[PDB]
Amino acid sequence: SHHWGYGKHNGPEHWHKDFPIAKGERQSPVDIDTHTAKYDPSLKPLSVSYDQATSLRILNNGHAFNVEFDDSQDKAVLKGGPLDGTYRLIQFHFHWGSLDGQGSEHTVDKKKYAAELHLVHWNTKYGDFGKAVQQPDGLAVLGIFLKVGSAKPGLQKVVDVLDSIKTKGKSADFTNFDPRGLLPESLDYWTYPGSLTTPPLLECVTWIVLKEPISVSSEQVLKFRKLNFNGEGEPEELMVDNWRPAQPLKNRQIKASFK
């Protein structure tokens, strides 16, 4: 009851109590039905420029873990696609499950994936992250599905450091990470106007969800599930099933960048 989370008492089901936007017109995530999400030839190609991405630190905030980036220049930026502007990378994080058969927030024809990677960018138009989240086109989030298969070499440096931030509030220096190690072979995508998938659930996100999932080993996802929602000294609550289920699409169109 204390403040929001993913348990029986404080979960997605109950977020409408302190956040009436939870039942709003533009909520995320959604289910991407491939028969309705039609192709849009007006969509320009997406330009992911991460070659100068400068990571700083990894931390556990009690809700997931974030790798944070220097956002002071156009070092890691997101351009074109459905975006009018330059969007700087500020952090990324994951949502995952207690079983391989669940963990993703978005779904494709009702299929759930073992996890989902969210790379979070803010529109430089507004000046900083804080001002951007108060505008409907302030954020662009790039969402990537994880399936249990073979190991992702780009993910291993993250996994190695997870013991050092087991409990809420812990953090660590995490430099020279290259977020390109987490991208799939193709950048074909769906896009729709949405929201943050956690409180305050603000409807300020242009979603870009990649068609092609990345593969991670079962050994690597097991490492995610040893994390803790709780602080050190408090009772153990395993950080698992930290995902919001799909929401009503309502009067929105999911445009597709592909065939």
**Residue 182: exposed, middle, or buried by beta-carbon count in 10 A (0-12, 13-18, 19+)?**
buried
Q: Is 63 a catalytic residue?
A: yes
> Residue 258 interacts with Zn ion (CB under 5 A)?
yes
CB of 193 to Zn ion, least distance (A): 16
Residues, the chain: 259
Q: Six-digit token pair at 167?
A: 């409990």
Q: Which residues in the 80-109 window bind a second copy by CB under 8 A?
A: none
Q: 86 a known binding residue?
A: no
Exactly one of 42, 233, 235, 236 binds a second copy (CB under 8 A); that residue is 233
Q: 9 a known binding residue?
A: no
Q: 93 a known binding residue?
A: yes
Closest of 96, 116, 135, 76 to residue 209, by C-alpha: 116
Exactly one of 2, 9, 35, 110 binds Zn ion (CB under 5 A); that residue is 35
> Residue 231 interacts with a second copy (CB under 8 A)?
yes
> Residue 238 interacts with a second copy (CB under 8 A)?
no
Binding segment (CB under 8 A) for a second copy, from list 44-52, 102-110, 142-150, 232-240: 232-240
User: Which residues of the chain form beta strands (DSSP E)?
Assistant: 31-32, 46-49, 55-60, 65-69, 77-80, 87-96, 107-108, 115-123, 139-148, 171-173, 189-194, 205-210, 214-216, 255-256
Q: 2 a known binding residue?
A: no
The answer to whether the CB of 185 falls within 8 A of the CB of 215 is no
Number of amino acids touching a second copy (CB under 8 A):
9
> Residue 61 interacts with a second copy (CB under 8 A)?
no
Collapsing DSSP to helix, strand or coil, 87 comes out as strand
Q: Which residues make up the interface to a second copy (CB under 8 A)?
A: 168-172, 231-234
Residues with active-site annotation: 63
Q: Binding site for substrate: which residues? A: 197-198
